[PDB]
């Protein structure tokens, strides 16, 4: 602006503004502030008209892609786009960020939260937490079961350390387990400082059986069943991660009543959260 | 911090040397005669046509009704005089074109035999240019060659 000499790059010349809307603007400043204020408006105007048009196009592209009654995603013609919808066949609305408590932290803490020992002593389960605990100590039919599952969670860690390569420990997932735990606690009053009435065999098997009933896919063909293992592959990895025996016993301290009502629920809500078919 | 107007109440209240004579040349000779001004572009110091070459030869080188466009006479006359003026030998050659920029306000002081002078208006000026001196011309000979 001519009210200045040339080569004057000074902040106030090139268009700083160092008052604030309270104490008014000085002609040069005011003019300047018009400049940017318009620039937004132009941008707003176009950035809509590009958006409105753009968005319209994508509508016609993905115009009729539907989920047919096999959880596979093909246009009118039938050209299969996605073999399992969204790659895991869960509807959108029933997702929540939840935490993958097997992938963060150290092995040390990992063990510490998970590693249960009966023959030896190192991470000895304290028998008080449940009835059988006293005579459990040093048994063998069970100790193996620990070694079995605890192996698996590690095989879930190598698995997940890979899958997410940056150790992100939160993801969208179907049914929020966390609340299911809490509802339980606050519907049978986990009266702490007590032995519970759940056996190690109560825990692991009922879980095993649980996983077998999150039927995303209904077939019986080694094709269909394959996807099933690879549908819930993650959502299981969480579930086991949560319901590690120690955790359930040591912290959540469920009863029989709590535990079955829980599992029966996780089934139910999951089945809701299945992507519906016929949804465009 | 207000708006005040009646200050009309205030404002109406606050209110050696050598002579060399001249002569406008007789007019009859002008009436019969046309003279004009030569200019050259030779960049030669004087280029006196005396030392140019001889000889010198300077010269220019029933139905129904209809609509005629309209022009002023001097333009038609001068347009008609499109034949460029050419002085020759039979050896070098000179041609020029009209300039129309500086023919208006121009009177000449003929240094007569006397120290006096006469004043003579300017009719035309021309700009003769030497040409064909190194005599290369390829009218369509380099033209068709050009497209290469």
């Amino acid at each position: 602006l001519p009210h200045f000499s040339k080569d004057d790059y000074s902040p106030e010349s090139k268009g700083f503004v160092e008052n604030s809307y309270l104490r008014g603007l000085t002609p040069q400043e005011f003019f300047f502030h018009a400049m940017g204020g318009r620039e937004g408006l132009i941008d707003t105007a176009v950035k809509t008209a590009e958006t409105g048009y753009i968005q319209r196009r994508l509508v016609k592209a993905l115009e009729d892609i539907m989920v047919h009654y096999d959880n596979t995603t093909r246009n009118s013609l039938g050209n299969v786009i996605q073999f399992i919808y969204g790659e895991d066949g869960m509807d959108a609305a029933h997702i929540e960020k939840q935490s993958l408590d097997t992938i963060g932290g150290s092995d040390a803490a990992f063990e510490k939260r998970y590693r249960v020992d009966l023959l030896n002593t190192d991470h000895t389960l304290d028998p008080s937490l449940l009835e059988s605990g006293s005579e459990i100590l040093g048994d063998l039919k069970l100790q193996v079961l620990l070694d079995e599952e605890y192996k698996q969670l590690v095989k879930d860690r190598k698995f997940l350390r890979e899958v997410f390569v940056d150790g992100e420990a939160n993801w969208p997932l179907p049914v929020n387990i966390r609340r299911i735990i809490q509802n339980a606690q606050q519907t049978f009053h986990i009266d702490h400082t007590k032995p519970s009435d759940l056996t190690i065999k109560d825990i692991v098997l009922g879980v095993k059986d649980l996983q077998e009933n999150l039927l995303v896919l209904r077939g019986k063909n080694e094709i269909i069943q394959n996807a099933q293992r690879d549908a819930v592959t993650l959502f299981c990895c969480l579930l086991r991660s949560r319901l590690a025996t120690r955790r359930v016993l040591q912290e959540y301290r469920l009863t029989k009543q709590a535990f079955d009502w829980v599992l029966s629920n996780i089934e139910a809500q999951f089945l809701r959260s299945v992507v519906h078919p016929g949804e465009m | 911090f207000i708006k005040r107007d009646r200050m009309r109440r205030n404002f109406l209240r606050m209110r050696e040397y050598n002579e060399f004579p001249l002569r406008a040349i007789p007019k009859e000779d002008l009436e019969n005669m046309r003279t004009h001004l030569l200019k050259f572009q030779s960049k030669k110091k004087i280029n006196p046509v005396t030392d140019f070459h001889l000889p010198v030869r300077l010269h220019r080188k029933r139905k129904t009704r209809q609509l005629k466009v309209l022009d002023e006479n001097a333009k038609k006359l001068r347009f008609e005089e499109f034949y460029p003026w050419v002085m020759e030998d039979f050896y070098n050659t000179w041609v020029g074109s009209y300039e129309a920029g500086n023919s208006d306000s121009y009177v000449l002081l003929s240094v007569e035999d006397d120290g006096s002078f006469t004043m003579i208006p300017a009719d035309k000026v021309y700009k003769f240019t030497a040409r064909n001196k190194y005599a290369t011309l390829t009218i369509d000979e380099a033209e068709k060659r050009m497209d290469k």
């Binding site: 790059y9 000074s10 902040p11 700083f16 160092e18 | -």
Partner: protein
């Protein structure tokens, strides 16, 4: 607070200082843009940062 207005002005000041300082550094021919951007463009990022951060 009438006082904290003072400090705003101080923060305004340091900027201009932080702005004026930089400027001569370029005119002294004594500026290095790091590898990738010209003298002037680096001069810009040098400045405009100083302004936004000061305002902020």
């Amino acid at each position: 607070d009438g006082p904290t207005m003072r400090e705003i002005t101080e923060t305004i000041a340091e900027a201009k200082k932080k702005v004026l300082d930089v400027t001569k550094e370029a005119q002294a021919n004594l500026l290095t843009a790091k590898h990738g951007m010209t003298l002037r463009e680096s001069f810009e990022d040098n400045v405009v940062r100083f302004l936004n951060e000061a305002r902020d």
